[PDB]
Amino acid sequence: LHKEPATLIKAIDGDTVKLMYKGQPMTFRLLLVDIPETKHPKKGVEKYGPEAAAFTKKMVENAKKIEVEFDKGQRTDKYGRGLAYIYADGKMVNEALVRQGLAKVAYVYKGNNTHEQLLRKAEAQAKKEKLNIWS
């Protein structure tokens, strides 16, 4: 797996951020996390939705270096979003959210599972600490 540099354009949700990647703007969906959304045709602002969104935003907004890491499976979803792990100054946003109890580990999409155990590890811990969604 290779980390590549990107530039923040805008944070959109807990699970989605818009980056400048290889010169072109592009939307990315965080791999392997299921996040309370502020979007939704229905349910919209769900429990921990604005908290996950605020966390993701602060994390990428305060970083001086954003890196994107694609996995070994399919690299975009049916809506055209890049499927990746996002790093803010060396620290993985995906893991951060799960460790803080602000997302759950999602079902593995299309062969994309290199960091699945690392995230499941983080999830059990947040669970054990009864954090946010696990309260």
Asked about 75 being catalytic, the answer comes back as no
Q: Which of 29, 67, 95, 123 is catalytic?
A: 29
Q: Are strands 104-105 and 33-34 parallel, antiparallel or unpaired?
A: antiparallel
Please name the residues in contact with 22: beta carbons below 8 A apart, sequence gap of 6 or more: 4
Q: Which of 103, 120, 23, 111 lies closest to 75, judged by CA?
A: 111
Spatial distance between the Cα atoms of 109 and 124, rounded to a whole number of angstroms: 21
Q: Are 19 and 8 a contacting pair, CB within 8 Å?
A: yes
User: In terms of residues, how long is the chain?
Assistant: 135
Q: Are 56 and 62 a contacting pair, CB within 8 Å?
A: no
Residue 32 DSSP label = T
8 - beta bridge partners? 19
The domain made up of 1-135 has a fold known as OB fold (Dihydrolipoamide Acetyltransferase, E2P) (2.40.50)
Which residue is listed with tokens 């818009």?
A: 18
Q: Which of 67, 81, 95, 99 is catalytic?
A: 81
Spatial distance between the Cα atoms of 24 and 113, rounded to a whole number of angstroms: 26
> If 0-12 CB within 10 Å is exposed, 13-18 middle and 19+ buried, where does residue 47 land?
exposed
The pair of structure tokens assigned to 104 is: 């759950």
Asked about 99 being catalytic, the answer comes back as no
Domain ranges of the chain: 1-135
Q: How many CB atoms lie within 10 A of CB 36?
A: 23
